From a paper:
In contrast, the NTQ rhodopsin functions as a light-driven inward chloride pump (called [name]). Here we report the atomic crystal structure of [name] from the flavobacterium [name] S1-08T. The structure reveals two chloride ion-binding sites, one at the active centre of the pump and the other on a loop in the cytoplasmic side, suggesting the pathway of chloride ion movement in [name]. The [name] structure comprises a short N-terminal helix, seven transmembrane helices (TM A–TM G), a C-terminal helix and three loops connecting the transmembrane helices on both extracellular and cytosolic sides.
Numbering used by the authors: -2 to 265
Write the structure that this text describes.
């Protein structure tokens, strides 16, 4: 369906190129699932005010891990090694699934941030609402644009412009809330959380770069590079970010007197 519309369909891949992609996707699932166990064992040390943030991390890990596992399988299904190269056998591969996943992943990532920020009640709800709508606006317009990567580069770029507008607006909101709510962080995670904003800024920005590969590197190597950028971005935005949110959650929990949090931080 969407497979003819992505640049992966245009090329034949060397055994090294095809195998590198498969290995990236495979490693990615391994990292996400390993992280998943860790987020899972560690959540018993998070006080309940914050425990939902850690659960969100586990949710993202599986959600992202499943999409990667599936991409890896869709990749091996799509091509066969014939006459010295991997050649397209059928229309089973597309990047469209990543976008669909982001529809779920991003709200989860944002919500875990708001929780450690100590937002609650009406503010949490309203902030969450504006953020996810902005995010959905970004993702959907982006999804529409990627559909035109094979045949209409101007069109991919215009949808890209619209997508970026939502992105910038989303960043302004998360940035503003982090900066206005820092003084309330305990432990003192007021310092850590600003690092979390910079990481997001860096990691999230890699997705747009990946989106533009058809525009500047329209060849088989470009395909490899985009999967690589997705990989760096995925580990940075989901896993590394997740480890920080959890750290902040544990630290805030101990500072507020939750004992399992204190014993845990202490036993290390
Ligand atoms: C777990 C997944 C994450 C954190 C994905 C984040 C994705 C983006 C920030 C996507 C951004 C885009 C633009 C701002 C412009 C082009 C289209 C997108 C969707 C790639
Ligand atoms: C689009 C829908 C957005 C709904 C936002 C979900 C809010 C999370 C829980 C916050 C709360 O109500 O305290
Ligand atoms: C390439 C795109 C990167 C764009 C912006 C963010 C990169 C910088 C992050 C540095 C960390 C700053 C800090 O911790 O104070
Ligand atoms: C910060 C997150 C780190 C992400 C992990 C990514 C791991 C891969 C890194 C480097 C390997 C580069 C080697 C590429 C050899 C090219 C072979 C070919 O494509 O033909
Ligand atoms: C070079 C590779 C760097 C990779 C960094 C990866 C994960 C870092 C996240 C760990 C959380 C640190 C908590 C902050 C603290 O200890 O004060
Ligand atoms: Cl609590």
């Amino acid at each position: 369906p969407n497979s003819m519309k992505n640049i992966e369909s245009l090329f034949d891949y060397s055994a090294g190129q095809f195998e590198f992609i498969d290995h990236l996707l495979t490693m990615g699932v391994g990292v996400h699932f390993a992280a998943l166990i860790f987020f899972l064992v560690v959540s018993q040390f998070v006080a309940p005010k914050y425990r939902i943030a850690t659960a969100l991390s586990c949710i993202v890990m599986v959600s992202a891990g499943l999409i990667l596992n599936s991409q890896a399988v869709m990749w091996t299904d799509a091509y066969a090694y014939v006459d010295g190269s991997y050649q397209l056998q059928d229309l089973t591969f597309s990047n469209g699934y990543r976008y669909v996943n982001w529809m779920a992943d991003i709200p989860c990532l944002l919500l875990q941030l708001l929780i450690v920020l100590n937002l609650k009640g009406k503010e949490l709800f309203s902030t969450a609402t504006w953020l996810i709508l902005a995010a959905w606006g970004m993702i959907i317009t982006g999804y529409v644009g990627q559909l035109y990567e094979v045949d209409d580069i101007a069109q991919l770029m215009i949808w890209g412009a619209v997508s970026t507008a939502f992105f910038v607006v989303m960043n302004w909101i998360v940035g503003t809330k982090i900066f206005k709510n820092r003084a309330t962080m305990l432990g003192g995670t007021d310092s850590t959380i600003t690092k979390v904003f910079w990481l997001m800024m860096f990691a999230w920005t890699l997705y747009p770069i990946a989106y533009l590969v058809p525009a500047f590197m329209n060849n088989a190597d470009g395909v490899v590079l985009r999967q690589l950028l997705f990989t760096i971005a995925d580990i940075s935005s989901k896993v590394i970010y997740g480890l920080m949110i959890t750290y902040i959650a544990i630290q805030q929990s101990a500072a507020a007197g939750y004992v399992p949090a204190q014993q845990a931080l202490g036993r290390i």
